[PDB]
């Protein structure tokens, strides 16, 4: 304990509030809902996207949002709790979305994140994949990628990976 | 073997207004040769940068000798550098045209209501696609004060929803002489012209001009004729120790854009790779980034050192000289 | 276990239940007879898995002492020579060294103040690094900003993997460019001298 | 119809629209008001990213409707 | 005197002016970092505004206006 001395001399004489503004102003699609375990603490919550259209149509995918104290300057850490067959999402549950890391700017909102997050399911892209096999099938065969995504959401094996059923009820 | 900043200066020299008036096929043949040289060049971004920056000054000064030549060049550049590069150029190109048209509309409007002493020709550019910069602190003494607010009238008549940021650093005007012995005529920068009614201390304040630039101006005024100290020729002239500054500037900006480019690339490759040794990383960053330029590896390394602190990648433990990707 | 609770109750401040104030931290150092700034106190803070300096959370203190199996200060002091001996064989000296980083900084920041990280280098890297003082002269001159985490971390591998005269050093290698900065600054002055160590 | 659009400054702007109008035009109206180039803009209407050459009647946008503006999105 | 003077100006977009886009606070109000305890306003050539504290930090990452990708410069 080095600087311990200095502190003593100075002894003798919420920053968000932003994520608050994000949440108040939040506008959710009919496909997306959010949950809070602790209504008092907004820096943690959950998001559920149920695509009504696309390959992932009729499916339930839940993401977790952890908002650091460096918000808006630091981006939220979000991960996909649902095991899914997607080029931009890995079995480890890491998400490849530009706004989440490099293209993040502190002019954005949780709303923004939600739109990009849904956008993955709307417009799945083989470019710079987290899952290479998924990106490869998406790349060469859309028919098979569709059949695959379906089998992945109803639950079943594709490869040696058992994909567990995520269907919305 | 010129090379790339100098090849750009070369092209400027070719396309600029000169006392010679180059014939068309000369222009075209030269330009074709320049592209031939350009294809051999390693760092093209510096070339593109200087070319654009100069092309700006040409267009804004009406100093192009041949318009169809410029147009042909931009054609050739688009063929090579692709659309994204020539987008800015092209918009610069058309924006000058609509600027000339708006200026003429103001000419038609100039001799009806209240014509005054100045024959007033202003060129206005987008917010915008033009590489220029905001003007310094200024004064705008005496008679010119009339035209400014006069100008600032009629836009409100056309579209009232726009704001004009005036570059006085790029603005020149003509003056004539009586008082001295032998008659001459002089074109001066508006900076030069504003000095005309004193000591540099109170002069700076009265003109509200920064002393740093003020000295740059008055040194070049003194080397022509006439801080606390008291004070077709033509006197508007580029300043020596300055405008070297803008070269440094330009090179800095190209360095920065190069950093962004590199970082992006290496992220791409790390994800693609998942893991790689330093050597292989550098190799790939190179072969991937070559067509635009060829980075000095201390730059590549400062980029890695940056993507470490931002937590894009980490060093594999126990393996020296090896990086792995994050999330 | 109640004994530990009473000792802790002697150290903690009345405002926070879990956090140990600085008045009590120097009390804690006084009873171990050491200096607050000592290497050993750092080793203790390392063993408690402390988050930051001058600051002991209840969980840190409690769990630290319980796996150190000490019911008192006097029982801790006797464990000090036990801790020092851990570094030697496969280490976990590295882990201690790297611990020092996040320990010494403020946990709102990714960097480390420059007058700091010198003090802790003169502490941990003392005797392991010859030109260490030269290094401190560097960046008191040529680099005025904070130390990056990876730079800190890698300085051990500098003090260990490469020679005193910096013969096997590569500037085209994987080192932090600040290490390269130092070496470039270094070789000129050191390549004309004969090491007696 | 006058549609409201939520910008990135944290406010809401009403703008003039015809249903036949292509949606890339609305981007330009938003540039005019908010000073953000139509080149980088993405319009989200109720959860989905609005197209460019497609029209506003293709999205069934009414005068009470609200648009969300966000920057470009890429998966990777 | 001047017979002929040709000048150069850039038309920039005029902006609503009301709200910091970083804190999503009001510009006249303190920035959110200062709200938890000198806080003033900064401008840009695009005519967008921010608190000093917000935009400075944004710049330390990258030199641009965050809203438009334009190079950042003060008034
Ligand atoms: Zn703010
Ligand atoms: Zn503030
Ligand atoms: Zn802006």
From Swiss-Prot, chain A:
Q: What is the effect of changing residue 5 to A?
A: Strongly impairs thioester intermediate formation
Substituting residue 26 to A results in: Strongly impairs thioester intermediate formation
Gene Ontology cellular-component terms for this entry are: cytosol; glutamatergic synapse; nucleoplasm; nucleus; postsynapse; presynapse
Stretches assigned to the UBC core domain? 14-158
The disulfides recorded in the entry are none
| Asymmetric dimethylarginine modification, residue list | 154
What would changing residue 9 to A do, according to UniProt?
A: Impairs thioester intermediate formation
Enzyme Commission number: 2.3.2.34
- Residue positions where Phosphoserine is found in the record: 35
Source organism, top-level taxon:
Eukaryota
Write out the similarity annotation.
Belongs to the ubiquitin-conjugating enzyme family. UBC12 subfamily.
**Which proteins does it associate with, and in what oligomeric form?**
Interacts with UBA3 and RBX1. Interacts (N-terminally acetylated form) with (via DCUN1 domain) DCUN1D1, DCUN1D2, DCUN1D3, DCUN1D4 and DCUN1D5.
Q: What does this protein do?
A: Accepts the ubiquitin-like protein NEDD8 from the UBA3-NAE1 E1 complex and catalyzes its covalent attachment to other proteins. The specific interaction with the E3 ubiquitin ligase RBX1, but not RBX2, suggests that the RBX1-UBE2M complex neddylates specific target proteins, such as CUL1, CUL2, CUL3 and CUL4. Involved in cell proliferation.
- Identification of the protein by name: NEDD8-conjugating enzyme Ubc12
Identify the species of origin: Homo sapiens
Curated annotation (Swiss-Prot), chain B:
Q: What protein am I looking at?
A: Cullin-1
Q: Offer one example of a GO biological process linked to this entry.
A: intrinsic apoptotic signaling pathway
Q: Does the keyword Transcription apply?
A: no
Q: How is it modified after translation?
A: Neddylated; which enhances the ubiquitination activity of SCF. Neddylation prevents binding of the inhibitor CAND1. Neddylation leads to structural rearrangment in the complex that allows interaction between the E2 ubiquitin-conjugating enzyme and the acceptor ubiquitin. Deneddylated via its interaction with the COP9 signalosome (CSN) complex. (Microbial infection) Deneddylated by Epstein-Barr virus BPLF1 leading to a S-phase-like environment that is required for efficient replication of the viral genome.
Native source species = Homo sapiens
Gene that this sequence comes from: CUL1
GO molecular function terms listed in the Swiss-Prot or TrEMBL record: protein-macromolecule adaptor activity; ubiquitin ligase complex scaffold activity; ubiquitin protein ligase binding
Write the record's keywords in alphabetical order, separated by commas.
Answer: Host-virus interaction, Isopeptide bond, Methylation, Ubl conjugation, Ubl conjugation pathway
The entry's family comment says:
Belongs to the cullin family.
From Swiss-Prot, chain C:
Molecular-function GO term, any one: ubiquitin-like protein binding
Main localization of the protein? nucleus
Result of mutating residue 180 to A? Loss of interaction with CUL1, CUL2, CUL3, CULA4, CULA5 CAND1 and RBX1. Does not affect both nucleus and cytoplasm localization. Reduces cullin neddylation. Loss of interaction with CUL1, CUL2, CUL3, CULA4 and CULA4
Is-annotated flag, keyword Ubl conjugation?
A: yes
Question: Which keywords does UniProt give here?
Answer: Acetylation, Cytoplasm, Nucleus, Proto-oncogene, Ubl conjugation, Ubl conjugation pathway
Report if keyword Acetylation is assigned: yes
Q: Its GO biological process terms?
A: positive regulation of protein neddylation; protein neddylation; regulation of protein neddylation; regulation of protein ubiquitination
Q: In the UniProt annotation, what is the result of changing residue 150 to A?
A: Loss of interaction with CUL1, CUL2, CUL3, CULA4, CULA5 CAND1 and RBX1. Does not affect both nucleus and cytoplasm localization. Reduces cullin neddylation. Loss of interaction with CUL1, CUL2, CUL3, CULA4 and CULA4
What happens on changing residue 54 to A/G/I/L/T/V? Loss of ability to stimulate cullin neddylation
Quote the annotated effect of residue 180 to N: Loss of binding to CAND1 and CUL-RBX1 complex but retains binding to UBE2M
DCUN1 domain segment(s) = 1-187
* Highest taxon above the source species: Eukaryota
Instruction: Quote the subcellular location field of this record.
Output: Nucleus; Cytoplasm
> Can you say what this protein is called?
DCN1-like protein 1
- Cite the source lineage: Eukaryota, Metazoa, Chordata, Craniata, Vertebrata
Q: Which gene is the coding source of this polypeptide chain?
A: DCUN1D1
UniProtKB/Swiss-Prot annotation, chain D:
CDD domains listed in its UniProt record: Ubl_NEDD8
(Microbial infection) Deamidated glutamine PTM sites in chain numbering: 40
Which Pfam family name is an example for this entry? ubiquitin
- What are its GO biological-process terms? anatomical structure morphogenesis; modification-dependent protein catabolic process; protein localization; protein modification process; protein neddylation; proteolysis; regulation of postsynapse assembly; regulation of proteolysis
SMART domains annotated for this entry?
UBQ (SM00213)
Name the segments for region: Interaction with UBE1C. 70-72
The domain of life for this entry's organism is Eukaryota
Q: What is this protein called?
A: Ubiquitin-like protein NEDD8
